[PDB]
């Protein structure tokens, strides 16, 4: 209905750096879109984010059993679940699939855009460079950015703004943590 | 490198709905089906290399409901402001006629987590193998959702995604053509 | 292996 809505959120964030070397646990509580009380593993107890959550921080901090239970979360909770799925989350590798095709911005009689499509790769950290006739084209390149598919794959459409001429040989080079060597795809005009 | 594993929860009133899910670097590892009271792994292979049978996850959402009622009173019954989504339609891979593909409808930056999403081929609703993810959490504490439609590319078919939201005046449509 | 649950705390 047109009735008002009220949203409560809880986020148990585990932040990992250098694997399990530096870990940080955040027990965060939210009302609608705003956080009102937080347990930072760096501090050691609950601290209000807004004045709305001050009763929650004071009430929880006065209970010694609770704080000691959350202070262990870096070892008992964060580091545990990190290693439970490390083999298929941190170490998950999927090969990309690069295809190149021309296109046009405006309805015209010739192509003015050339698209390089990298699809279905994990993790998402990737590098895509454009080359025309061996010389890399830095100017006139418009990237799409990383796109989360929601099914543990990524994609991005880095495209080169150029009117391709007959005889020119374009190449799209991609380097991804899953590839042992740079991957190239050529497109002759 | 840097990794984040967030255990996200919410409870929504008066809808009395809530969900419980884990997240690794933005992707859902699994979620708890509040109706069947079981773990639903986002990728089927996770259910063989991991395990999670938590009756207390339901108890977590029960606590969230109780905490929500107290916070609602604390805020003088301040309701949540509707944040309209930003709908986008894209394909799984590049389009090739007579080569199957997937059409993704990415609903992003919206709250509360309640939406009505439908696929429209030539204005006619479609529901053949349609799929969707749960409400995924964001860094700005808004939500995002995915909808999936396997299809055979053709020039006669024109598709649309109709996403209705309380922050939207009219049902938002985003078209995709070949 | 097997994911823990982090208990959400109740308030008064």
């Amino acid at each position, epitope marked *: 209905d047109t009735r008002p809505r009220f949203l409560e959120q809880v986020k148990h964030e585990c932040h990992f750096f250098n694997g399990t070397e530096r870990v940080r646990f955040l027990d965060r509580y939210f009302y609608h879109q705003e956080e009102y009380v937080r347990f930072d593993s760096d501090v050691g107890e609950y601290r209000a984010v807004t004045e709305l959550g001050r009763p929650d921080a004071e009430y929880w901090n006065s209970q010694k059993d609770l704080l000691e239970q959350k202070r262990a979360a870096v*070892d*008992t909770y964060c580091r545990h679940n990190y290693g439970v799925g490390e083999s298929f989350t941190v170490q998950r590798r999927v090969y990309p699939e690069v295809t190149v095709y021309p296109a046009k911005t405006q309805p015209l009689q010739h192509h003015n855009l050339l698209v390089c499509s990298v699809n279905g790769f994990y993790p998402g950290s990737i590098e895509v460079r454009w080359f025309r006739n061996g010389q890399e084209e830095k100017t006139g390149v418009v990237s799409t950015g990383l796109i989360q598919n929601g099914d543990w794959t990524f994609q991005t459409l880095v495209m080169l703004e150029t009117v391709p001429r007959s005889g020119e040989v374009y190449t799209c080079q991609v380097e991804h943590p899953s590839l042992t060597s740079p991957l190239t795809v050529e497109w002759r005009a | 490198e840097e990794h984040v594993i967030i255990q996200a929860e919410f409870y929504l009133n008066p809808d009395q709905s809530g969900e419980f899910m884990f997240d690794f670097d933005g992707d859902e590892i699994f979620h708890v089906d509040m109706a069947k009271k079981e773990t639903v792994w986002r990728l089927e292979e996770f259910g063989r290399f991991a395990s999670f049978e*938590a*009756q207390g996850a339901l108890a977590n959402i029960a606590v969230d409901k109780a905490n929500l009622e107290i916070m609602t009173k604390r805020s003088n019954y301040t309701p949540i402001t509707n944040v309209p989504p930003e709908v986008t339609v894209l394909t799984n891979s590049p389009v090739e006629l007579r080569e199957p593909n997937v059409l993704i409808c990415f609903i992003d930056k919206f709250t509360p987590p309640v939406v009505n999403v439908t696929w429209l081929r030539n204005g006619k609703p479609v529901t053949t193998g349609v799929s969707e993810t749960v409400f995924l959490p964001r860094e700005d504490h808004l939500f995002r959702k995915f909808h999936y439609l396997p299809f055979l590319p053709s020039t006669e078919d024109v598709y649309d995604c109709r996403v209705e939201h309380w922050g939207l005046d009219e049902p938002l449509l985003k078209h995709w053509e070949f | 292996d097997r994911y*823990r*649950l982090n208990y959400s705390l109740p308030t008064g």
Partner: T-cell receptor
Amino acid sequence: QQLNQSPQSMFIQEGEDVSMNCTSSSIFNTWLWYKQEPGEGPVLLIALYKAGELTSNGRLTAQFGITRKDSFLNISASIPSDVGIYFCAGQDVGNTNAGKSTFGDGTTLTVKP
Amino acid sequence: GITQSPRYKITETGRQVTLMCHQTWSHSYMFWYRQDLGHGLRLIYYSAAADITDKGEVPDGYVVSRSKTENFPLTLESATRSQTSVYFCASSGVPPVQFFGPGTRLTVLE
């Protein structure tokens, strides 16, 4: 019996010291110690949530074994009021997900005066 | 506070009796145990939250219900003489720590 509580029967003259053991068949994350007075229900004595912790509560002191599978409780300067059963509880990952605690069989302490 | 009722109970064989456990702490978790000689505490049933129930070590011969966060009624279906025990009820706001009740001494007689 996923939790082995030894000993189960003790006879301690006043002033002497008591030490109870408790071993786990799975890696534990928390340990609980209870005491059941005759005719009453078991109540909580000490809780330990960190490995190698050594928490005290008067003459009671309890240790969280670094094996994540052992736990001890000591009662210094035994008085006759310390009679009763002492339970040892804990949680593994499965327990934490279910919100339950596995209990040991217990130790029946009889302090003679 | 967790409280039990009845505290003592003599029932006949084959009859249906239901022991009640009431808590005002608004705790989410509740538990029903039975303490005998040589077995210690043994979980019969328990409830993570309202409208949620699961079985424990000794769930045969018993049923349970939890339609509210206050009451967790343990119910013997058909009273057997093997069910003569001391029944304890516990609760938890945030586990593992539990708060037990005074207990109930049930005696099933022919």
